[PDB]
Design a binder for this molecule. Sequence first.
Ligand SMILES: Cc1cc2nc3c(=O)[nH]c(=O)nc-3n(C[C@H](O)[C@H](O)[C@H](O)COP(=O)(O)O)c2cc1C
Ligand SMILES: Cc1cc2nc3c(=O)[nH]c(=O)nc-3n(C[C@H](O)[C@H](O)[C@H](O)COP(=O)(O)O)c2cc1C
Ligand SMILES: Cc1cc2nc3c(=O)[nH]c(=O)nc-3n(C[C@H](O)[C@H](O)[C@H](O)COP(=O)(O)O)c2cc1C
Ligand SMILES: Cc1cc2nc3c(=O)[nH]c(=O)nc-3n(C[C@H](O)[C@H](O)[C@H](O)COP(=O)(O)O)c2cc1C
Lengths: 200, 201, 200, 201
Amino acid sequence: PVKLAIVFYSSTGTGYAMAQEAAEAGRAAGAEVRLLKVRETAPQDVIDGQDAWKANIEAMKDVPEATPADLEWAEAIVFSSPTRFGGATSQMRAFIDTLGGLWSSGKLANKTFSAMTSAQNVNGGQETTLQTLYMTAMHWGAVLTPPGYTDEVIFKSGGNPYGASVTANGQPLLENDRASIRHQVRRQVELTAKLLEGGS
Amino acid sequence: APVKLAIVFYSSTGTGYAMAQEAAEAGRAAGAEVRLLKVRETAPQDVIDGQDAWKANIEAMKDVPEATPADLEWAEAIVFSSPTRFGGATSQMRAFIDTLGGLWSSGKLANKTFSAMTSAQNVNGGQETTLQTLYMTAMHWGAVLTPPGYTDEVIFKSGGNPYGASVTANGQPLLENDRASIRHQVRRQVELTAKLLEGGS
Amino acid sequence: PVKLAIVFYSSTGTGYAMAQEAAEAGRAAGAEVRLLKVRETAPQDVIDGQDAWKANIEAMKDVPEATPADLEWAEAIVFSSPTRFGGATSQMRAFIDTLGGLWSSGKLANKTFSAMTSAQNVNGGQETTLQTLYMTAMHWGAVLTPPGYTDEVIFKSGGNPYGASVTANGQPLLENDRASIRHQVRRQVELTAKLLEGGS
Amino acid sequence: APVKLAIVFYSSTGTGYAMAQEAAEAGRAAGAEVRLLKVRETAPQDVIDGQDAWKANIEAMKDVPEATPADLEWAEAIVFSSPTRFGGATSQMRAFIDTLGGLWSSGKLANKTFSAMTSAQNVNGGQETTLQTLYMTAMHWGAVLTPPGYTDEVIFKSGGNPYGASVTANGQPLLENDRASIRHQVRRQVELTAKLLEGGS
Ligand SMILES: Cc1cc2nc3c(=O)[nH]c(=O)nc-3n(C[C@H](O)[C@H](O)[C@H](O)COP(=O)(O)O)c2cc1C
Ligand SMILES: Cc1cc2nc3c(=O)[nH]c(=O)nc-3n(C[C@H](O)[C@H](O)[C@H](O)COP(=O)(O)O)c2cc1C
Ligand SMILES: Cc1cc2nc3c(=O)[nH]c(=O)nc-3n(C[C@H](O)[C@H](O)[C@H](O)COP(=O)(O)O)c2cc1C
Ligand SMILES: Cc1cc2nc3c(=O)[nH]c(=O)nc-3n(C[C@H](O)[C@H](O)[C@H](O)COP(=O)(O)O)c2cc1C
C-alpha cells in the first residue's frame, strides 16, 4: 500500500479537523496513513490567552509529532497550514527549515506533494499560502499533485484548484469542504500508486 | 491640480466593466480627474458571436475609449482590472501591458501609484493570484504599490481581500459590499497619491 | 511511448534554441515529440522594427502552430515563454486562453507539466514567470514535475529548481543551460512513463 | 523631524548582516533616523553548535539589538531582509512577523513604507520568490510598497532584481554592485517616505 504522511499545523483546531478528514480519505483509498502534528513553538502564556488554542492542544495530545523521517517513510505528502499574513505559519516553517540534511541526501525527491490552508476571510490569503507551500516543495524535486478542478465538489466548496481551503469562523467544517478534502487526497493516493506501480 | 487617475479594465461579459465604473466614480467622488479605459478586444468576431453577453458587453462599451500608453504617461494613479484566466490576468490585459515597453524605457512609469482588481467564477479560483501577477508587474516599473490591506471594516465585509477588490462573477448586479471595498481601495489610493505629489514640489 | 508536447513562444530565438534543445532531449528519451510554436500576435509593423525578430519568425516558418488538440494528444507538456515584466508573454497567454473548452471537458488533467523561460537579467523574472505558468497548470489539475535540484547541472546553471531559465544576451545557448534543459525533459518523460505504464 | 527607518533582518552567517549594515549606512546618509534590528534567533543550541560560522556571527551581532513590534510602531519606513529557505523566508523572520497581530489589529502598521532584500546560495534559487512572499505579507498590513524597480543603472549591473536587493551568498565579500543597489533601494525609499509625510504634515 501507498504510504501517506499528513503534516498539519493548527492553533485553534480548523486545521486539525481538516487533517483528520484527509486521513480518513487516505485510509478509505487503501492508503497507509500517518497523521502528524507540527511542533508548537509559542510560549505558554500566549496559548493561555485564548481558549480554542489551549483546547486544541489538549485534543491533539495523542497525535504524534512530525519529523523529517516521516517524509522519508512517506511516498505522498500533504502539508496543511493556517495562513499568517498570506504566507504559512512560522510553526510550519520551523519544521521545514529542519529538512536540510534530508534534502541534500536526495530522499525528498519524487514524493507526491499537495497542500491545504485555512483563514478567516474567503480571500485573506487562501490561495497565496498554498502557493508558498508549493514553491517550497519544488526545491525538493517533488511531483506536485494539486486537485485543480477535477469535480463538481470543487466548484461546490468555493472552487480552489490549488488545494482545499476553509473559511475559519469557529464553526464546524462545511460538508462541501470535507468533500473537497476527501477528493484531493484520494486523487493524490491514486496517482502516487500509479507512479510506484510503473516504477516496478 | 487634482490627481490624474487612469482605470484600465478588460471585460468580456461585463462584471469587469461594472467594477471599473464604480472605481471610476469612487475617484471622481474623491476629487481625482479620472479616465475610464477599456482594454482592446483581440478576440475574433465569430468567437465573440457564440457568446451573447460578450456581444452585448462590447456594444454596451461602445463609447468608452481604448486604453493607450499615452493614458498611463498622463496619469499619476493607475488601477488595473482583469478577469482571471487560469489564475492569471487575461491575454488582452497582458497585450496592452506589452505595449508599455517604450514608456518603461523612458522611466515614465516610475512612482505612479498602482493597485488592481479581478473577478472570477469561483470564490478562490484565482481571485488572489491574478492580482499578484499584476502587482508583480507594477514592480518592474518602479510603481509605488497601494493595495487596500485591511485598512477598513468594509473589506472584511466583502470577503477580506487585502490584495485588492475581487468579485465573484455570477451574471448578477455587483453586491453592495463589493462596491464598498472597491470605493475604499480607490479613495485610499487617491488620498495617498495626493500626499505624494504635494511633498514633491 | 510518451507523447510530449513542447509548446513555446519566442521573438528573437532564445525560446526557440531552448525548445529545440528540449525536443531533442525528449526524442533521445524515447518520447514521441511535437515541437510547437505559439502564434505570433504582434502587429507586423512592430516586428519589422527588430532584425533578430523578423529573422526568428523566418527560422520557425516550418514549425507548426500549437492548438488545443496538441495538448489533448500529449501526456507530457513543456511550456516555454520569455518574460514580460515578470510574467509570460501575451502570445503565450493568448494560446492558453483558447483552452477553456478543453478545460471543461476535464481533458487536461493528469498530464505532466514543467516550464522554462528566458529573461534579459538574471533576476528579472526568471522565477516569477515560471511560477505563473505553473499556477495555470494547477487549474487544469496537471501533475507538475519541476526538476528541482535533482542534478549537479542544475547548480551549475544558476540553480533554478522551478524550471530551466536562460539569461538572454544575444549569444548562442551556453552548455550548462543545454544540459539542465535536457535533465528537465529527461526527468519528466521518465516520470510520465512510470505514470502511464503503471496506470492501465 | 527626519524619517524613522527600521531595518529588521535575519542572518545566520553574516551575508544578511553585511547587507543590512550597508542598508543602514545608506539610510543615515539619506538623512533618516535609522535603527538596525536583528530578528531574534530561535533555533536550538545543539544545531547552532554544529556550525561555528553561525556561532561566530551570533557573537559578532552581540551589540546589535533585537527587533520588536515597538521598533515597527516607531518606523515610518521598514526594510526586511531574510535569506532564502526553500524559496520562502526563514522561520525566524516569520516568527517575528507572527508577533505583529496586536499592531496589525489596531491598524498600527498601515501606510508605512516597505521594501525587502534577500540572499541565497544559488542565483536563480528563490531570490525573487522569497522577496515576493515578504511583499505579500506587507500588503496584508496595508503598507505602501516601494520596490526599487529598474529605476537606476546600478540594479542592472547587480543582477537586475526589481523586487529588492538580492545577493548570491558564496562566502565572498559583498560585491561593489550589490551595495550600490542596496543603497539605491533604501535611498529611494527614504526619499519617497519623506514625500508622503510632508504631504499631510
Ligand atoms: C498573526 C496571525 C496572522 C493572521 N493573518 C491572517 C490573514 O492573513 N488573513 C486571514 O484570513 N486570516 C489571518 N489569520 C487568521 C488565521 O489564518 C485563522 O484563524 C486560521 O485559519 C485558523 O486556523 P487554525 O484553527 O487551524 O489555527 C491570522 C492569525 C494570526 C494570529
Ligand atoms: C478561458 C477562461 C479561463 C477562466 N478561468 C477561470 C478560473 O481559473 N477561475 C475562475 O474562477 N473562473 C474562470 N473563468 C471565468 C472568468 O474568470 C469569469 O467568467 C470572469 O471573471 C468574468 O468577467 P467579465 O464579466 O468581466 O468578462 C475563466 C473563463 C475563461 C474565459
Ligand atoms: C515589453 C517586454 C518586457 C520585458 N520585460 C523584461 C523584464 O521584466 N525582465 C527582464 O529581464 N527582461 C525583460 N524583457 C526581455 C525579455 O525577457 C528577453 O528579451 C527575452 O527573454 C528574449 O528571448 P526570446 O528571443 O525567446 O524572446 C522584456 C522584453 C519586452 C519585449
Ligand atoms: C535549509 C536551508 C535551505 C536553503 N535553501 C536554499 C535555496 O533553496 N536556494 C538557495 O539558493 N540557497 C538556499 N540555502 C542557502 C541560504 O539561502 C544562504 O546561505 C543564505 O544566504 C544564508 O546566509 P546568511 O545567513 O549569511 O544571510 C538554504 C539554506 C538552508 C539553511
